[PDB]
Design a binder for this molecule. Sequence first.
Ligand code: BCL
Ligand code: BCL
Ligand code: BCL
Ligand SMILES: CC[C@H]1c2cc3[nH]c4c(c3C)C(=O)[C@H](C(=O)OC)c4c3nc(cc4[nH]c(cc(n2)[C@@H]1C)c(C(C)=O)c4C)[C@@H](C)[C@@H]3CCC(=O)OC/C=C(\C)CCC[C@H](C)CCC[C@H](C)CCCC(C)C
Ligand SMILES: CCCCCCCCCCCCCCCC(=O)OC[C@H](COP(=O)(O)OCCN)OC(=O)CCCCCCCCCCCCCCC
Ligand SMILES: COC(C)(C)C/C=C/C(C)=C/C=C/C(C)=C/C=C/C(C)=C/C=C\C=C(C)\C=C\C=C(C)\C=C\C=C(C)\C=C\CC(C)(C)OC
Ligand SMILES: CCCCCCCCCCCCO[C@@H]1O[C@H](CO)[C@@H](O[C@H]2O[C@H](CO)[C@@H](O)[C@H](O)[C@H]2O)[C@H](O)[C@H]1O
Lengths: 255, 280, 42, 43, 38, 42, 318, 55, 55, 54, 57, 57, 57, 54
Amino acid sequence: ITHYIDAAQITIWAFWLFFFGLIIYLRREDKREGYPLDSDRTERSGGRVKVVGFPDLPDPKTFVLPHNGGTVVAPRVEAPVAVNATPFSPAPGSPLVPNGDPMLSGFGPAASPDRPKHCDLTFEGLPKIVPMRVAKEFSIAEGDPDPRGMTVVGLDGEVAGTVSDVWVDRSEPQIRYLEVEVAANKKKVLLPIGFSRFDKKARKVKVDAIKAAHFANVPTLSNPDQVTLYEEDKVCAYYAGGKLYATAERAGPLL
Amino acid sequence: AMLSFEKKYRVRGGTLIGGDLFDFWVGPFYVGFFGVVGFCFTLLGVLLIVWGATIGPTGPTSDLQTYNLWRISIAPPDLSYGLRMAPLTEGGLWQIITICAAGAFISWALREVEICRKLGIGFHVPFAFSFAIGAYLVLVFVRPLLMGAWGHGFPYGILSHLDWVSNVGYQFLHFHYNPAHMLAISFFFTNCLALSMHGSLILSVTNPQKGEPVKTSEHENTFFRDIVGYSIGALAIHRLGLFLALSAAFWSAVCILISGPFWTRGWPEWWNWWLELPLW
Amino acid sequence: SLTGLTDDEAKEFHAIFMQSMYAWFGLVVIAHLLAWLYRPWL
Amino acid sequence: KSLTGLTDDEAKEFHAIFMQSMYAWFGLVVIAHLLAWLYRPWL
Amino acid sequence: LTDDEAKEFHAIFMQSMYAWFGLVVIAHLLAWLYRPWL
Amino acid sequence: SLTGLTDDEAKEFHAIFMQSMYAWFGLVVIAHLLAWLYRPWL
Amino acid sequence: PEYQNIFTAVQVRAPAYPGVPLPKGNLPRIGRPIFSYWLGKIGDAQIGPIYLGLTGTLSIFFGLVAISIIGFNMLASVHWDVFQFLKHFFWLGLEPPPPQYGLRIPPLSEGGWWLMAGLFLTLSILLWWVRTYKRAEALGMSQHLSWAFAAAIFFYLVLGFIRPVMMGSWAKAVPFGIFPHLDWTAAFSIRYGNLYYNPFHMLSIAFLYGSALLFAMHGATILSVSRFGGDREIDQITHRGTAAERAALFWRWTMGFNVTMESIHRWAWWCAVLTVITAGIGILLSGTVVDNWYLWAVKHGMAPAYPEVVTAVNPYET
Amino acid sequence: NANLYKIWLILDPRRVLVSIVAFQIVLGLLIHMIVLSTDLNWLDDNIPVSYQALG
Amino acid sequence: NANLYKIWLILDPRRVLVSIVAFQIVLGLLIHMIVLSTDLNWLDDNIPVSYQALG
Amino acid sequence: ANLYKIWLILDPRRVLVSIVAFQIVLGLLIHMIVLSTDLNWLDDNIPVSYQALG
Amino acid sequence: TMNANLYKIWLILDPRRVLVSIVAFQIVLGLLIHMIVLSTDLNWLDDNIPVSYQALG
Amino acid sequence: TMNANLYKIWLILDPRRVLVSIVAFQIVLGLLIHMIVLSTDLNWLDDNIPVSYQALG
Amino acid sequence: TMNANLYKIWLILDPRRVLVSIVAFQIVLGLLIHMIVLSTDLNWLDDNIPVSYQALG
Amino acid sequence: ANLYKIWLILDPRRVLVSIVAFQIVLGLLIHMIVLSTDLNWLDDNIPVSYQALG
Ligand code: BCL
Ligand code: BCL
Ligand code: BCL
Ligand SMILES: CC[C@H]1c2cc3[nH]c4c(c3C)C(=O)[C@H](C(=O)OC)c4c3nc(cc4[nH]c(cc(n2)[C@@H]1C)c(C(C)=O)c4C)[C@@H](C)[C@@H]3CCC(=O)OC/C=C(\C)CCC[C@H](C)CCC[C@H](C)CCCC(C)C
Ligand SMILES: CCCCCCCCCCCCCCCC(=O)OC[C@H](COP(=O)(O)OCCN)OC(=O)CCCCCCCCCCCCCCC
Ligand SMILES: COC(C)(C)C/C=C/C(C)=C/C=C/C(C)=C/C=C/C(C)=C/C=C\C=C(C)\C=C\C=C(C)\C=C\C=C(C)\C=C\CC(C)(C)OC
Ligand SMILES: CCCCCCCCCCCCO[C@@H]1O[C@H](CO)[C@@H](O[C@H]2O[C@H](CO)[C@@H](O)[C@H](O)[C@H]2O)[C@H](O)[C@H]1O
């Protein structure tokens, strides 16, 4: 006997039903941050219309933090935060332009959310990211130079200061920040390893993100022996603003 | 609309070409010069694909014309045209769509560079996307050029390009023995293993067993040391995944590039250099 | 409202919208008249 | 407080320049097609 | 939306849908007369 | 209680849901009667 | 120029981490950890310690027996000649039993060793699965890894056990050998009328390509935001930072939508897992349900048609 | 049962309604396509007539 | 039923409308494409005449 | 009768932009489909065949 | 029969983005139409009219 | 032969997740079994019973 | 038959940026048109005019 | 008469470098095109075929 329907055809159709169900599941999970959307439709509706697209948002999940750190929920209602910028044009879809000195505006690649004002912790409950002054069990791996005492140069090759310490991850041993004693003001500021190139034979750290004089305004730590999530983002974002803001040419275009 | 945290990142500038002229978004999409340029290449290419489906291989009235999604095929020219432009109905349509595709892909990558400049992030993603583009260009440009005809490109058809792969592969009798192909596949498989391991580990520590708090960096490291005696680290797994995926694309491009231009016999017979070493 | 438009603003946009749509449909029937006269398909 | 930032007077001003420019463009298109129809009528 | 707003939407929604269904029936009556399929 | 509906609100939604679902099943039965008359499949 | 965060320029050292303490019933870990400078250039320099209870000890014993039986048979097939074993290594193999034996335990001289290696490798893998399950349990972690591992085991089982049993013959299973298992792969497509036309083969390819696409995207995305600590995905998930915001906006502005730091790992999980689910289903249907995938595709209207420019008279017709 | 209405105290009516609608639409498309792939096909049965015949 | 209007207190009227429009358009394209794949095809049935035959 | 109130519900701009995009795509689709058929008016050699002139 | 307040569309639709959209679409459409016509009997480049230049050579 | 305190199963297992899972499992099982039965001699759709409708037209 | 305030277009589009876009569009269009013409009977490179230089050897 | 003002609105150095990069690519393209035609001067065996000479 012959039939057009066969088991291979049945099974492939069954797969499509599963797969489209899976995609809808995934798109819901994708909306646990950043939704509902900031639109001009919600503004004029007086907030009546929430823009969420399809599928709609999932019910909130809870993240229980260790060491009695509290509970995080997702999705969550997050308060609007003023933008320190003015639109270049009033038309929708236009960019904005930072107010004041761009490096210091907290806008564009200088921007960042306000992370929590407590430190990431080791499993045992100590501050995770700390200078080698504090975690004395750490050493420099034999074969590699000690960054302490190296001179830090900005994007234009001028001396910004000297490395005064190294900040390490106690959970997963690696350098996360260099501590820079800034020549101009004698403050000690963090420098993320992600923005640092070593010139080993010269014992120099090169920082392409900012000029030497920009080190004077790197955001400062409340406590010299630990760093909060909040301060980590403020530090890293300040260097990143330099990628677009630190010189005029960086605005573009090429042509 | 914008993500609820997005407005504070929508900054002016960072373009490579265009400046204020095209420096705007359309809904979620950033446009810019390469958005406009890429849009034209893209819309043209797609519409020429639909036009090619409309007239088929031998005209819209023949039994070979079809809108069946699996059977639509836009094919390159006969090898006899060499490096010249064929007539539109004899493979030239494929050649124009190819140029559109390359321009759409490259414009997409440069748009990505402008977005990285706005966001002040590293350029790893457009750099990585360049490996996929490079493999596509080996297939439709470098390898056809080295053999002397654009007609060595693959056809633009969902199933018809699988026929191309099969017949190019079996020209070398047993294509599995291509050494760069073995290496590339090893990277594809290792990448899939590594991806499932990475996805699993992040989800299992952020969604722990009921009653448990969110797990730690120490848990992540401990877990794979417990299984294999080694943990590569949370930064390095992303280095590794990028290395495996780009290596898979790179050795792919190499393996088709040597198949024809740098080797014409069966692929098993390449291994005779090994068998013939004066050691055994 | 849900769009924000006032009641009179929705009456104003509707008059222009409906007028413009009817004009476009008038063009569509005229084209289908010419095409039916040139090449009837049923 | 319009969505685009244009005042009513600016919209009127842009609309009149947009309409004249589009009519001129369509005018060239009609001339192009009359010429094409005289050389190679296709229906 | 309030209760009276739901009543107003529902009355206008039902008339709009039946009108749409009316066009569907006319389209299908024309199609049956031109090309019956059963 | 776990959804947010009161004990009366659940009684009211059930009444309309059941009348709605029985109406839909009625349309289904009529359609299968018409199908059986046109093309008996058993 | 900028630091790309591909290689660690300056490593630091601390006393080796012995690991998160395990609950009662787990055995103490074994090994004295060492440090590798060169591994420390690309990732973690620490090697060891390792956990090894009953599950893993049994797994490793079964697995070494299986591997040794394969290597032994390879060397025997060149008459103990170690130099010829190195010459022909990629060609040598441990061969499935002949078809005449069906699913019966075949003689030691002609297929018994294949059947034992498959049995013992399979038990070794199943016990390794239990190991991955137990190691997550002892740390209080969810079982995502063992679920994905089970999907790969499913495919492995279909290749060597389920399909051969369904088809009535160990001769239809896979040989243990480098080039021999490539012969088997090509021959399987030939025998079943071109695996390109198997729709679950097509899906498995979409997901294998998609896995490399997604790890290239995600790997590169995270390194581009590692300057903001984006590689620390746990705290970016509980406490969204500018790393996670910039990552999502890069993709939203590029392609119109985006995911979250947690949910990209769900996309990655399913993409990788579906690679081997669809692969198992595709092989499971070959021979049992569909005997010629090309003709199955013709029947369902999928195969392209071409102008006829070559054709051959069938001498079986003549 | 007389208290079956209490099912709406544990299941969200909005979610159940949309899910039923989604399920029914998929099922209807699935069933039509199944029947079209059997002898019961009512579109290509050339009943009442074959329209490609006239030509 | 009389309280059936209260469904617009349960399901968002704006979202429902947009879903109806999107579904109907996709359904209309699907049905035309299915019908064109059958004997009922009204475009290539050479009715009322074959226009390619006129050439 | 109160149908103008649709613009109190559906955003007029997005409806407009949706209609323009949809109609252009549909217009391109329909011309293609008809061009795949006997109705094709470009390659029908009506009123004459221009390649038969050369 | 154009509405007197049709100009108000530029209070809803931004001039710059509409202008860019039109130029991009029209460029694609003109390139498409030329290539469609070229692949038919209306082809004016390959019709050997007024003469075939590969024939006179 | 029914236990009187079996109602206490709902103190152990979530009643909502059980009911959700039951409905999902039954729908998948019902789809599965129809396809299995269709793929056997019992096939009732493509069996030309009571008649073949393709042979008519 | 143009508009006397057509120059106001430079208050909407950045003129130095329009220059770069025009030039690179025109180069790409020029590349395309030479290729298309080369694909037809009008080909001036392969027409053996004034002579076939491959047949000279 | 005011063409020199082009360098008041476009960067002189990046115009130059664009020109250099464009010209070289174009040169390779045109040589490739000519070589793929009847005008090929490398394999035309003019003034003589050096291979047939052996
Ligand atoms: C037998 C077939 C016919 C033929 C019949 C037709 C018909 C019929 C028409 C054309 C039209 C065109 N034909 Mg033809 N055509 C033929 C053969 C040719 C050949 C050739 C190699 O054979 C060439 C190269 C062309 C070229 C052209 C173009 C000049 C024009 C399409 C322009 C366009 O799409 O702008 C895209 C549109 C825009 C960009 C918007 C309008 C632009 C305005 C003027 C202002 C924009 C300026 C802006 C600020 C900057 C723009 C630059 C950007 C940076 C990119 N034709 C033959 C002989 N052709 C069309 C035409 O003339 O339009 C009037 C037309 O109607
Ligand atoms: C021989 C094969 C038969 C055939 C026998 C059957 C049988 C038997 C049934 C259908 C049903 C349907 N068929 Mg059929 N069907 C045939 C041919 C067609 C063709 C076609 C192009 O040939 C079309 C497009 C349809 C379309 C349809 C839909 C009207 C309906 C499925 C809707 C649904 O899934 O609800 C999902 C949506 C919801 C649940 C949303 C809520 C419902 C809302 C309130 C109502 C919306 C309007 C409703 C669809 C109006 C139609 C009801 C009429 C009584 C028809 N059939 C032929 C001739 N068809 C079914 C049906 O009518 O259900 C009552 C049904 O039982
Ligand atoms: C034998 C087959 C017929 C044919 C039968 C039809 C039929 C029937 C119709 C068309 C329609 C169109 N045809 Mg046709 N068409 C033929 C051959 C051609 C060819 C060609 C190269 O052969 C071209 C390029 C076109 C081009 C067009 C477009 C002008 C138009 C679709 C516009 C659109 O999608 O609006 C989408 C854009 C919008 C909705 C934006 C809003 C409206 C704006 C303000 C106006 C845009 C331009 C407008 C349509 C001006 C054109 C009016 C002309 C008098 C036609 N046709 C032949 C000879 N054609 C349609 C049409 O004219 O509609 C009125 C239509 O109904
Ligand atoms: C290098 C490792 C891997 C990789 C990485 C990679 N790919 C990437 C990226 C990266 C890092 C992106 O950033 C980019 C992206 O944005 O992803 C979301 C992209 C991407 N990789 C994509 C696809 C993709 N990548 C693949 C592979 C890979 N990409 C690798 C294995 C494949 C395979 C394996 O087949 C495909 C199908 C897209 C999702 C996206 C690029 C999107 C883009 O360029 O958009 C512009 C173009 C269009 C919108 C369509 C253009 C249409 C053409 C003009 C006409 C069509 C012509 C085409 C040649 C026809 C082909 C027909 C047949 C073959 C079916
Ligand atoms: C051919 C037939 C189809 C083949 C498809 C085979 C698919 C199964 C094979 C893979 C096995 C995976 C096992 C692990 C699963 C898992 O792990 O899911 C659990 C995790 C959640 O865990 P957590 O991280 O939240 O918390 C961990 C703390 N316990 O993820 C998910 O919820 C993914 C969501 C499931 C996908 C939904 C798909 C729904 C389809 C509906 C279709 C409707 C159509 C209706 C038509 C009438
Ligand atoms: C001499 O060598 C020494 C001793 C020094 C050690 C060296 C060893 C070496 C060099 C080994 C080399 C091994 C290589 C190169 C192996 C390559 C293997 C490959 C590529 C294998 C690929 C695929 C194989 C598969 C998928 C096989 C699957 C078989 C299965 C699943 C069989 C299952 C069988 C079962 C469950 C049997 C049950 C028995 C029953 C119960 C049925 O009994 C009645
Ligand atoms: C979880 C369970 C899922 C069950 C899945 C079942 C899905 C079945 C969907 C079938 C797809 C629709 O199939 C419909 O039927 C007939 C088959 O008679 C097709 O008809 C066509 O099929 C083939 C392929 O070209 C031709 O050889 C046949 O002569 C022709 O009539 C129609 O083009 C299609 O409209």
